[PDB]
Amino acid sequence: ERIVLVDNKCKCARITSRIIRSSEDPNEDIVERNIRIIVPLNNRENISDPTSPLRTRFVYHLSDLCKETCYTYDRNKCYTAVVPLVYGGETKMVETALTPDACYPD
Amino acid sequence: IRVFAIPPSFASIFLTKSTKLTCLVTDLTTYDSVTISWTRQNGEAVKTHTNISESHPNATFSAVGEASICEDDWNSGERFTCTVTHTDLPSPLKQTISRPKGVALHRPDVYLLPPAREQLNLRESATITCLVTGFSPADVFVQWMQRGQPLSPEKYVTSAPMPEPQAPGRYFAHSILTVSEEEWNTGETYTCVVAHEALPNRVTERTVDKSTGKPTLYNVSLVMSDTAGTC
Amino acid sequence: IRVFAIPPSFASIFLTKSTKLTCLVTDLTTYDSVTISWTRQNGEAVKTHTNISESHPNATFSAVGEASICEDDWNSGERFTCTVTHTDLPSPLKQTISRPKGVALHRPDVYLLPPAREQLNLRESATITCLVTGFSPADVFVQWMQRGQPLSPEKYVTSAPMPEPQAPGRYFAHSILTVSEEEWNTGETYTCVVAHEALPNRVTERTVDKSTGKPTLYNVSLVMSDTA
Amino acid sequence: IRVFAIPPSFASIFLTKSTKLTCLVTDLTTYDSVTISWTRQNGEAVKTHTNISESHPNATFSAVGEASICEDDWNSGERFTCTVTHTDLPSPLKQTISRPKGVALHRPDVYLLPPAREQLNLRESATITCLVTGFSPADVFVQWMQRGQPLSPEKYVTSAPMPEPQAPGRYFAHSILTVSEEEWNTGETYTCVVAHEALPNRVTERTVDKSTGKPTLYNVSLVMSDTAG
Amino acid sequence: VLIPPRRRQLCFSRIVRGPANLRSLNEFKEEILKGAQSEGKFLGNYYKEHKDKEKALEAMKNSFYDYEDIIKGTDMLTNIEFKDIKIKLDRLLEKETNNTKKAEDWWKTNKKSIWNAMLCGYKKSGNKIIDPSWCTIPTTETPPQFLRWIKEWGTNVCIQKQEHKEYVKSCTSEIKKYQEWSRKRSIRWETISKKEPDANTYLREHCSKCPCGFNDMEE
Numbered sequence A: 001e002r003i004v005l006v007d008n009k010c011k012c013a014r015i016t017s018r019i020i021r022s023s024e025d026p027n028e029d030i031v032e033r034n035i036r037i038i039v040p041l042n043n044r045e046n047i048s049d050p051t052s053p054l055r056t057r058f059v060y061h062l063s064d065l066c067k068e069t070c071y072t073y074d075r076n077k078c079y080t081a082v083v084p085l086v087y088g089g090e091t092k093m094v095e096t097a098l099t100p101d102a103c104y105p106d
Numbered sequence B: 001i002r003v004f005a006i007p008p009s010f011a012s013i014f015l016t017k018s019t020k021l022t023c024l025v026t027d028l029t030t031y032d033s034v035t036i037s038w039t040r041q042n043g044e045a046v047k048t049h050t051n052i053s054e055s056h057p058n059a060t061f062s063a064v065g066e067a068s069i070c071e072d073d074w075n076s077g078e079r080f081t082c083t084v085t086h087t088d089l090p091s092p093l094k095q096t097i098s099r100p101k102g103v104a105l106h107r108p109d110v111y112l113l114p115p116a117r118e119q120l121n122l123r124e125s126a127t128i129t130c131l132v133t134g135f136s137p138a139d140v141f142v143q144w145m146q147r148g149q150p151l152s153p154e155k156y157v158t159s160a161p162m163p164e165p166q167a168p169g170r171y172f173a174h175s176i177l178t179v180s181e182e183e184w185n186t187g188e189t190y191t192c193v194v195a196h197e198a199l200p201n202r203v204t205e206r207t208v209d210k211s212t213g214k215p216t217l218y219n220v221s222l223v224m225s226d227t228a229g230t231c
Numbered sequence C: 001i002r003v004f005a006i007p008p009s010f011a012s013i014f015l016t017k018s019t020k021l022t023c024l025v026t027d028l029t030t031y032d033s034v035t036i037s038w039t040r041q042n043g044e045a046v047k048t049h050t051n052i053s054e055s056h057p058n059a060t061f062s063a064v065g066e067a068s069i070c071e072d073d074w075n076s077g078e079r080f081t082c083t084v085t086h087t088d089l090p091s092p093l094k095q096t097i098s099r100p101k102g103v104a105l106h107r108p109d110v111y112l113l114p115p116a117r118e119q120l121n122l123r124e125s126a127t128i129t130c131l132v133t134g135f136s137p138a139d140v141f142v143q144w145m146q147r148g149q150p151l152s153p154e155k156y157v158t159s160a161p162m163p164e165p166q167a168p169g170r171y172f173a174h175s176i177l178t179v180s181e182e183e184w185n186t187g188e189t190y191t192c193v194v195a196h197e198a199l200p201n202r203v204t205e206r207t208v209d210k211s212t213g214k215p216t217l218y219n220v221s222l223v224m225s226d227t228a
Numbered sequence D: 001i002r003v004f005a006i007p008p009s010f011a012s013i014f015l016t017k018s019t020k021l022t023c024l025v026t027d028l029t030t031y032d033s034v035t036i037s038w039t040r041q042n043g044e045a046v047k048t049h050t051n052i053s054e055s056h057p058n059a060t061f062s063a064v065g066e067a068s069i070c071e072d073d074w075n076s077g078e079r080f081t082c083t084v085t086h087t088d089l090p091s092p093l094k095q096t097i098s099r100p101k102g103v104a105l106h107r108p109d110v111y112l113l114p115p116a117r118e119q120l121n122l123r124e125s126a127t128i129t130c131l132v133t134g135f136s137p138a139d140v141f142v143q144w145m146q147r148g149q150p151l152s153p154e155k156y157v158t159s160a161p162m163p164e165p166q167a168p169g170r171y172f173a174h175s176i177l178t179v180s181e182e183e184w185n186t187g188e189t190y191t192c193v194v195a196h197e198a199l200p201n202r203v204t205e206r207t208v209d210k211s212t213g214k215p216t217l218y219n220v221s222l223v224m225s226d227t228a229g
Numbered sequence E: 001v002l003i004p005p006r007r008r009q010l011c012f013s014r015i016v017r018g019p020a021n022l023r024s025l026n027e028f029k030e031e032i033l034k035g036a037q038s039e040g041k042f043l044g045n046y047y048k049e050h051k052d053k054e055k056a057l058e059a060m061k062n063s064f065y066d067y068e069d070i071i072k073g074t075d076m077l078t079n080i081e082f083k084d085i086k087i088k089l090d091r092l093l094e095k096e097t098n099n100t101k102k103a104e105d106w107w108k109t110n111k112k113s114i115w116n117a118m119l120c121g122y123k124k125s126g127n128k129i130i131d132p133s134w135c136t137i138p139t140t141e142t143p144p145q146f147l148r149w150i151k152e153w154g155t156n157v158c159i160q161k162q163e164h165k166e167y168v169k170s171c172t173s174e175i176k177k178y179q180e181w182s183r184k185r186s187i188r189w190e191t192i193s194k195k196e197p198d199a200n201t202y203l204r205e206h207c208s209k210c211p212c213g214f215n216d217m218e219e
């Protein structure tokens, strides 16, 4: 019976405007919008940049996500950044894997 | 007069995009009689010693072998033997090195731990340990960074892989970096990288600062606006 | 043809609870008139010797004679030598075992780092790690005790003492112990016993618990409005 | 005349890391160079006793005889006998003492209680009592260490072991480290080193800080009136 | 000894498995051992459709006897299951009751062997009716299946060998990659060598599903 209005994965939100029938008598049925949000509490400010500050503030204006300052890594998407590496004095760029679990070659 | 064949470290395989074999002999008199040929499993020898570097502070002889071989050829399991004909050695010896057969591939889960609260209370130094757990093959490569600036190789010291007690196939590695507690108290981010085969693109990184390593306080300012937001 | 003395290290002394002295003969075959006697500077080599090893095809036998002596007396550097008289080599051979006084004594600063929250979140297994730093002698011995009972050496792997580049006179060693997440969330307390010579009491403990590292202050501030 | 034999207590063996076998004499007329000695099961000669007490003003001389022995012989049950040989003594007297046996070993439980909040408000001192309960036999050596350095015995006082009400064999003890609140408000280790025979490694520690405990202090501060309908 | 997945399929409550002792055996060990109604996730989650219905209940028979031997002398060697305090949690509480009965005298999964027999957990999620003949194994039966040395062995071939067998009957290197269980048979054969001559006959005649399995792989 749930109608999942929004499932934005950056600003994790699961607004479900599920209708609930009231008791045995209809015509007073209640409508409820369950904004289930999972604040990460640990993700960095610029989530793709690990060296950025920590998120001490989480704005969830529901108007924007109904229709970006990304917070939570999406399952399918891979967030990564280049890293410097030194082995014998050579500084070689290479891509990283900030979410290795979902970033296997597929 | 000891010569040892060094198996190809994955650091050279990946970052330099080449395979180099070094069967170096040290603590021997200089006669320049070394004839080093990296004979393969087949009769053909891929390459001989190149760029011999005798110059050292101790003035002892030092001949280093080289073998530029294909990475796929390495993965095929072909073995290579280094032979030394120096008169110091009583007889020539061949050092066969082979790529291990049937090694399982498992992701190197990288966990970065912050210095203990008590250690910071010491107000003298703080040690950050990057733990690499559950990886196969045993070979692994770890480096350290701070806000995009790699640290000196001496500042961070890593441990040789040892078997994982619960998973005999897997291994674990241990790398520790030390910094002044003021640097840690500043909140400077420290990032640890692990270069290993099992990873998707062979490199993964994790970072930690004062505010995320078992922090005492969670300062949240959660704000929601336009709760209704019908659409 | 040489005899290799085996000075039981601090790890062996602590584990076995007693000093069991052994010197092992290498590359020599058994001969008549074999002699063994722990001789100090004083010369009172009156120790009992028992369980003499027999000849080994590779000419490597122990000819071990075990003795019990105080820890502190050995720490004084008595320089025990098992005198061996053999037919092929008339000259007796001496193999001193003693503690070099030159080595310093810096107490370990053992730190117990709980499992990273990234392990617990994945919810498979938690790897407690004990960090032992600041000890000059390379003779650490780490035991893990859970619920006050020693754990088998199989469950944990103690890294060998390696040099610490940042401290020339001190070495460090770690000993990770991995437990099932369902066991760490149970609240069990794991104590990292570290046994070392330089310690004032020769033993130190650190306790790690489910709640050793916890956020002491949650500061959330929900701000719910109706307009932009 | 009469002699006293003093077996080494757990504190003596532990505190000095050596076994001291002192044999003092009481009610003995003073005379120069009084000879005393111990004897083992084999009767081997003892180390030349030294540090003999002087002649007391009360005309009673105390001849103390100490011999250093290996802990293995005494902890194996081998018995020692003290013999006194002197011209003043009518005849030698033999007193045999050994490690008591037959007592069931029980692991001490070292619970460390932080000072009461009431004591802190007085601002004068704080008592960090270390509770060593449930151990047998009644021989424990409780010590205090701060930042890995032993604290002076003047600061901490340890009550003698006493029987525990719940069980007969079990005993308990205490150890109170009086420290100024200023030394306690700032986090300090204050480890309670407890040495006892039954322990796996003969020692146990319990650290206490102002941080230890301190349940998570949630501070939910939610503004909800922004909604108007 | 080759420990099966009894390490995890045992889903003891936190109280018994943890350091905390139990207050009263009549109410907490009482309610905690039944508290392992969570020992009903075989058909609840895993065996719900993976295998036939009978095997899911057969796995519960394995847990029950395992549960019984945790209470008195199993062979796990772990501070939470054997050499553990949970066995002492029992002895401590009964001994507190004036030695009213030894854990191995009564309450040995004999006096109150029935429990729920885990069938509530079986029924809680799987919701599959238990046949009357199937309802006597999750509860007590006189055979103890010999101290887990030859029951956990009983379970090895019930799945860990017969399903690889039927895979083989269903690349050849992967088929030949099922011989490492043949070397692992040797050390456990030594273990049993410490009634019937060897382990093979036990599978042949004590066991029912075992004769399907090949006696020896031998590549």
Ligand SMILES: *[C@@H]1O[C@H](CO)[C@@H](O[C@@H]2O[C@H](CO)[C@@H](O)[C@H](O)[C@H]2NC(C)=O)[C@H](O)[C@H]1NC(C)=O
Residues within 6 Å of the ligand: A046, A047, A048, A049, A081
């Ligand atoms: C900081 O956030 C910005 C977006 O707000 C991102 O910066 C760019 O991200 C793209 C995405 O692949 C990269 O290709 C660019 O290289 C990034 N910019 C630069 C200057 O490198 C990114 O999420 C964060 N920036 C960085 C450097 O990680």
Ligand SMILES: *[C@@H]1O[C@H](CO)[C@@H](O)[C@H](O)[C@H]1NC(C)=O
Residues within 6 Å of the ligand: B217, B219, B220, B221, C219, C220, C221, D221
């Ligand atoms: C706690 O949160 C409030 C509001 O969110 C903020 O004003 C205050 O500074 C925070 N305190 C700390 C110690 O972070």
Ligand SMILES: *[C@@H]1O[C@H](CO)[C@@H](O)[C@H](O)[C@H]1NC(C)=O
Residues within 6 Å of the ligand: A056, A057, B219, B220, B221
């Ligand atoms: C805590 O959060 C509040 C609200 O965002 C902010 O004003 C304050 O500066 C923060 N303090 C710290 C120490 O992060």
Ligand SMILES: *[C@@H]1O[C@H](CO)[C@@H](O)[C@H](O)[C@H]1NC(C)=O
Residues within 6 Å of the ligand: C217, C219, C221, D219, D220, D221
């Ligand atoms: C608790 O929250 C209030 C209001 O959010 C704030 O004023 C106060 O500083 C906070 N106290 C802390 C974080 O200790």
